[PDB]
Design a protein around this ligand. Structure first.
Ligand SMILES: Nc1nc2c(c(=O)[nH]1)N(C=O)[C@@H](CNc1ccc(C(=O)N[C@@H](CCC(=O)O)C(=O)O)cc1)CN2
Ligand SMILES: Nc1nc2c(c(=O)[nH]1)N(C=O)[C@@H](CNc1ccc(C(=O)N[C@@H](CCC(=O)O)C(=O)O)cc1)CN2
Lengths: 405, 405
């Protein structure tokens, strides 16, 4: 950076502080990743200066000759990546992506079937404090109390009983494979649309390491910044018969000017995902998750569903006699950055929580392998089984520093 | 750029063409500006990797120590810049800034009073093809058919008649000063809340060249990328009594994770606006627009409202038999970039329009003075009056290149 240190030392210092922290700490937040320097150069470009309301060739402004190309690259690479008939790459967020689809098929107060928050579901899947629970009538399905797996019989029962207009499958903290065909089977039985939110597993779907929801869903929504390893933003994938409707929902429906620089960055992110070395990368994330889960089990931690089938695992911290709020803070002190996370049937509210959610997507990107996962789990063990010990706390800091070196 | 040209040639070529076009063409899109290289460096930072749901000190993730500083800086500066009691810098957009406020003070179907689209109002101020007009019952106020100035008597009438829960003031294509005193006076008469959308005029307000809405409004929504000359995104300013409810409306209400990198650039922009430089700049913006307006009138163009008190002007193109769509396309040919824009009482639809909107915020940033505005108005006069003339289009191209170097 050249001009920022000069004009704004306060902001620059804060950024450099953060830039060092991302290298000095061990980022284990499941939804987080480290983007390429090409992705950052794209959003750090002049495309922020451009108003491009509308779509390629159909704009409400002049001078869009070149941002139209950037957006077409994004749309076509997306369709190539997931096999979808249509793509919308303008959503500013996953939330805005989800919001748009809801705005497309649902009237105010319509019945929607979504995964319960504490069981794994996202805020936009029907949380009472989110716009989804407020705007639409959400009924919640969930997981088994013992196996912690989606009860599709429960789902069918709810669908037959409540007769929803749309069913939403997918989750923010479900360590297992979701069967989209069963969800579609249930949706056709009750005459409902199917939405799948692949935000967390989007990079795994592109790499063939999680079954594709696209052939089974009318609408597929995603973020671009999780396992897809792109810029902070959203995306919608749909069948040709919903293309125009979805596009109008984004604009003039729920958004205004699109972020063309972030859209440019999306195109790079998708270009990177199309390459072979991303499949190799994605395999390492899944392998690093399976190992870390098993390594945490060896330390004597308990995990929901007994492990993982994808990128993330969910530690139940009840036997360790700790809340997620403590675990997060104490691990953050020594170098391990996680997030407090709600477990199925969690006795605590989503601000306190009875567990922590760990992801391997970020650490894999910076070159950590199987041998490294073993040390991560041992540090987490040393810290969480010896809470108040300043000796264990300090040893952990030396060991984390040895990893990030 | 160092890594994008090698990684993604197709995306890099498009960005460079766009970069060249920004310099080569005369960008007169009223809602566009050119950010500093410092603002660009901030958006391209590693802050894009951080999930920071919640607020400084109240985060649902770990490792936020530094992004918190970035957000605090953005907020405290915004308060210093506008004299607001509270600020929210997380809105992805001006669209989302407005949406959250509507989500705070309004329930579904509620009556809201906002400015008509063609009379100058924005899409989010009650369009029936926008969520605002679909979620809420919007009654429209407009401007006088002869003077094109807000009929405040009509606003007062519409307010007494429909008893709205909220009044929205401010516009996308209103070339005159909006009396906020009168709006609050009206809002207090019917007991309604007042929201002002200063998005377009934020930079002028920061410089004491437009009456500040903050003292008169309960809520002040804005974009950061217009006359404020910052990154693409939104912001909410409000009185202290709504502070907590506003923060909840953004998250977990209508948005997910904030764009921390954009919030860094938001902090940089407000810092640029706090300097003595900015006030001088903003003066030239208003002076250049006033000159360009007068110069266009000498050429024979009919201007909505007869001139401009701000950064913006609307050309009524009906006398010269041209739609806005046509005028936008022909000026693009000669190297002048505007957008087609609806005028008060437009006989045509928003996709065709009877006029064009012109702003000076962007050309003033690159150093154009009062003498450049004279030339620009001459070129626009040469082209739009000699539409088919191929020798008139070529002379324009040469005069545009003489200005842009
Ligand atoms: N299962 C699951 N885990 C997740 C998410 C999620 O949406 N679902 N998240 C993705 O967002 C992150 C956490 N974000 C969250 C933010 C707010 C609330 C929430 O319900 N807040 C309420 C209740 C507060 C309390 O009682 O503690 C509120 O603020 O009123 C939940 C999750 C990470 N883990
Ligand atoms: N006064 C004003 N000027 C403005 C805006 C605005 O919101 N208000 N804009 C805000 O950024 C841009 C225009 N954006 C717009 C986009 C769509 C529609 C609209 O009503 N579209 C309808 C019908 C259009 C058609 O097909 O002819 C539709 O899409 O169904 C209007 C304005 C530029 N100038």
């Amino acid at each position: 950076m050249k001009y920022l240190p000069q004009q704004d030392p306060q902001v620059f210092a804060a950024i450099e502080q953060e830039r060092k922290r991302q290298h000095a700490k061990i980022e284990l937040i499941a939804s987080e990743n480290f983007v390429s320097r090409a992705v950052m150069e794209a959003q750090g470009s002049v495309l922020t200066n451009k108003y491009a309301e509308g779509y390629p060739g159909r704009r409400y402004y002049g001078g869009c000759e070149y941002v139209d190309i950037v957006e077409e690259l994004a749309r076509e690479r997306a369709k190539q990546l997931f096999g979808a008939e249509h793509a919308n790459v303008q959503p500013h967020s996953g939330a805005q992506a989800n919001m748009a689809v809801y705005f497309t098929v649902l009237e105010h107060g319509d019945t929607v079937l979504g995964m319960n928050l504490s069981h794994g579901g996202h805020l936009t899947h029907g949380s009472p404090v989110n716009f989804s629970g407020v705007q639409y009538n959400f009924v919640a399905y969930g997981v088994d109390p013992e196996t912690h797996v989606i009860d599709y019989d429960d789902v069918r029962e709810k669908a037959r009983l409540h007769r929803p207009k749309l069913i939403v499958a997918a989750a923010s903290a479900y360590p297992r494979i979701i069967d989209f065909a069963k969800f579609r089977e249930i949706a056709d039985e009750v005459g409902a649309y199917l939405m799948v939110d692949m935000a967390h597993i989007a990079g795994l779907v592109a790499a063939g390491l999680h079954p594709n929801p696209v052939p089974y869903a009318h609408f597929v929504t995603t973020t671009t910044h999780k396992t897809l390893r792109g810029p902070r933003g959203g995306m919608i994938l749909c069948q040709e018969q919903f293309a125009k409707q979805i596009d109008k929902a984004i604009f003039p429906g729920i958004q205004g000017g699109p972020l063309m620089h972030v859209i440019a960055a999306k195109a790079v992110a998708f270009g990177e995902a199309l390459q072979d070395d991303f499949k190799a990368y994605a395999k390492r994330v899944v392998d690093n998750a399976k190992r870390l889960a098993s390594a945490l089990q060896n330390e004597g931690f308990t995990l929901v569903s007994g492990g993982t089938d994808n990128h993330l695992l969910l530690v139940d911290l009840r036997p360790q006699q700790l809340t997620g709020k403590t675990a997060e803070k104490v691990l953050d002190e020594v170098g391990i950055t996680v997030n407090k996370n709600t477990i199925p049937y969690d006795p605590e509210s989503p601000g306190v929580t009875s567990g922590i959610r760990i992801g391997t997507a970020a650490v894999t990107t910076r070159g950590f392998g199987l041998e490294e996962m073993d040390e991560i789990a041992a540090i987490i063990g040393l810290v969480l089984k010896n809470v108040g010990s300043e000796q264990a706390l300090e040893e952990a800091r030396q060991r984390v520093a040895a990893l990030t070196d």
